Amino acid sequence: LNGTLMQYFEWYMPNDGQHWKRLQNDSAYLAEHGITAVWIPPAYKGTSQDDVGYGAYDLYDLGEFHQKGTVRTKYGTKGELQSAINSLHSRDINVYGDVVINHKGGADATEYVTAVEVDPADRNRVTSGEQRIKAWTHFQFPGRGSTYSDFKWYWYHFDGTDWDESRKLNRIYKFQGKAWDWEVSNENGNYDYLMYADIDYDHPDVTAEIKRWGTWYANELQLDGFRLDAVKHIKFSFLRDWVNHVREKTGKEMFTVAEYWQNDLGALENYLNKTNFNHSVFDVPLHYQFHAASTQGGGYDMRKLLNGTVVSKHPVKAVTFVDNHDTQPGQSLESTVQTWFKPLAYAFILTREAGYPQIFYGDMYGTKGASQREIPALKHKIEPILKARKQYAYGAQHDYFDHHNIVGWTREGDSSVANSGLAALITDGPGGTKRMYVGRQNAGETWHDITGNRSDSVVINAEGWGEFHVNGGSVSIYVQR
Ligand SMILES: OC[C@H]1O[C@H](O[C@H]2[C@H](O)[C@@H](O)[C@@H](O[C@H]3[C@H](O)[C@@H](O)[C@@H](O[C@H]4[C@H](O)[C@@H](O)[C@@H](O)O[C@@H]4CO)O[C@@H]3CO)O[C@@H]2CO)[C@H](O)[C@@H](O)[C@@H]1O
Ligand SMILES: [Ca+2]
Ligand SMILES: [Ca+2]
Ligand code: NA
Ligand code: NA
Numbered sequence: 001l002n003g004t005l006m007q008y009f010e011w012y013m014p015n016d017g018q019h020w021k022r023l024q025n026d027s028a029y030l031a032e033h034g035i036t037a038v039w040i041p042p043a044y045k046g047t048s049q050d051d052v053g054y055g056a057y058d059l060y061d062l063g064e065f066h067q068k069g070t071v072r073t074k075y076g077t078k079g080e081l082q083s084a085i086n087s088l089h090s091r092d093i094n095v096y097g098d099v100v101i102n103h104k105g106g107a108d109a110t111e112y113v114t115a116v117e118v119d120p121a122d123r124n125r126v127t128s129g130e131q132r133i134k135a136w137t138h139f140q141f142p143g144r145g146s147t148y149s150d151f152k153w154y155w156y157h158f159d160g161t162d163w164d165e166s167r168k169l170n171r172i173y174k175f176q177g178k179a180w181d182w183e184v185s186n187e188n189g190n191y192d193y194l195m196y197a198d199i200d201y202d203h204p205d206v207t208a209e210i211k212r213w214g215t216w217y218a219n220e221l222q223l224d225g226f227r228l229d230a231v232k233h234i235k236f237s238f239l240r241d242w243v244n245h246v247r248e249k250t251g252k253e254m255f256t257v258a259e260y261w262q263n264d265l266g267a268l269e270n271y272l273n274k275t276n277f278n279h280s281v282f283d284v285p286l287h288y289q290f291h292a293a294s295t296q297g298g299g300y301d302m303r304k305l306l307n308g309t310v311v312s313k314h315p316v317k318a319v320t321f322v323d324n325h326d327t328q329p330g331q332s333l334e335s336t337v338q339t340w341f342k343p344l345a346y347a348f349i350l351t352r353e354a355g356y357p358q359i360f361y362g363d364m365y366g367t368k369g370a371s372q373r374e375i376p377a378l379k380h381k382i383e384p385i386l387k388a389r390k391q392y393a394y395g396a397q398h399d400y401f402d403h404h405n406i407v408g409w410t411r412e413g414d415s416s417v418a419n420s421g422l423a424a425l426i427t428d429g430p431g432g433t434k435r436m437y438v439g440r441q442n443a444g445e446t447w448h449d450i451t452g453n454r455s456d457s458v459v460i461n462a463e464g465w466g467e468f469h470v471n472g473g474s475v476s477i478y479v480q481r
Helices: 019-032 077-091 204-221 236-250 265-274 282-294 302-306 342-351 360-366 379-392
Strands: 003-008 037-040 093-099 109-119 120-124 131-140 158-161 173-175 197-199 224-226 255-258 280-282 318-322 355-361 395-399 406-412 422-427 431-439 446-449 457-459 466-469 477-481
Touching: 003 360, 077 204, 077 282, 093 204, 093 255, 093 446, 109 158, 120 280, 131 158, 131 173, 131 197, 197 360, 224 236, 236 265, 265 280, 265 282, 265 395, 265 446, 280 282, 280 422, 282 302, 282 318, 282 342, 318 342, 342 355, 342 406, 342 422, 355 379, 355 477, 360 379, 379 422, 379 477, 395 431, 406 431, 406 466, 422 431, 422 466, 466 477
Parallel strands: 003 037, 003 355, 037 093, 093 224, 224 255, 255 280, 280 318, 318 355
Antiparallel strands: 109 120, 109 131, 109 173, 158 173, 158 197, 395 406, 406 422, 422 477, 431 466, 446 457, 446 477
């Protein structure tokens, strides 16, 4: 099984309401290129129509109720999403729903709340006496009413907020009688607080409600799994329990991957430990290695790609990726893998045996930000690498990370996939050649570069070795003609 995830959105897509229809219409294309799952953007009403989805106003409004100036979300209506999902399912493409449960944004009304300021660099330090603020904490859901859920939110379901509406002041406010949740990331002392109204996962009605919404959401969209947002800001034991709860209620596997944003393998290992390895994480350290290689012009030691990553230590729990909606140009975690290196990074995640790779909408189709640093559409460069995964990346792997610039790996093929087997080379510097073992069972075959970057044929010798070539700053992936 070479499962391939696709993140089916980018930050700057137009707010025209056609995204679910686009997905529906792309399902044939996705299936043909070996995509077996899609992570869809948050499907519920944000703070406005053009919310990318992380505002999280109303978790039960999937583009169904007239709230925040619109019925549809940015992406379309509930029915359009459901039509896209049934089209994806008709081609055996799993659908992972984005789960934004750190906070709620865009409350319907303010409440007077007693609060103290905390230090934004050290949220365990209180920096004021008690003061009365007006906080956006009251959620009534006037367009929805009680349809699907009569749960209403008030200040006492939250630990704090970043805005006092009476003084018009952006500070971090912790509400009276509240405490930041733990365990969370210990950056800035305690990183429970991120944005909007921060949900209090010490509150038992909150833990109950978010669990039952989880089950509701899975049922409503027939989800096959989840993508968990911003998990370093959400009580770890709660996330663990939430994942088990929805699995228990649905009776489905519910593959789950969490976005724990830290370039630190040890912090990710800690998160995995505290959630009992019941779900995966995005391989954030690998992303940063790709970013670094792509900006150092050949000076990066390409041997380092094998160490310090989630996929190197916990391959079963790694979702590997090149870029996402936070790392793309202009976004809050900007660390974009430069255009020239991006196909090499894709070869790395797509054709190697370890990890569950994810391709980025923004990489395939380009990003539509207002800058001139936008990622170009690289679909045509990635397609042959996807085909390499789908048809050729099977069987025993041999690594050649034995050079500062030119590194490679082979796959011997497997008898259960006809003509499978590949030989990949990437280089962040000058090109050249590497002899690599592809398996004696491929002796005498004529192999060629599926990317078309190199036009030479390589005949595998009797001992199972081929002499493979790669251009400067390029990738070649040889497979049987
Ligand atoms: O309809 C399409 C397919 O849907 C189903 O496949 C699912 C699996 O059920 C999910 O569990 C998941 O598979 C992941 C797996 O969870 C994850 O751990 C990872 O495993 C890799 C591992 O990273 C790697 O190091 C190496 O050991 O190989 C493992 C897999 O061979 O990646 C898996 C996907 O490659 O998602 C898929 C859908 O993408 C269903 O069971 C299939 O029958 C169906 O075709
Ligand atoms: Ca939080
Ligand atoms: Ca709390
Ligand atoms: Na909290
Ligand atoms: Na190098």
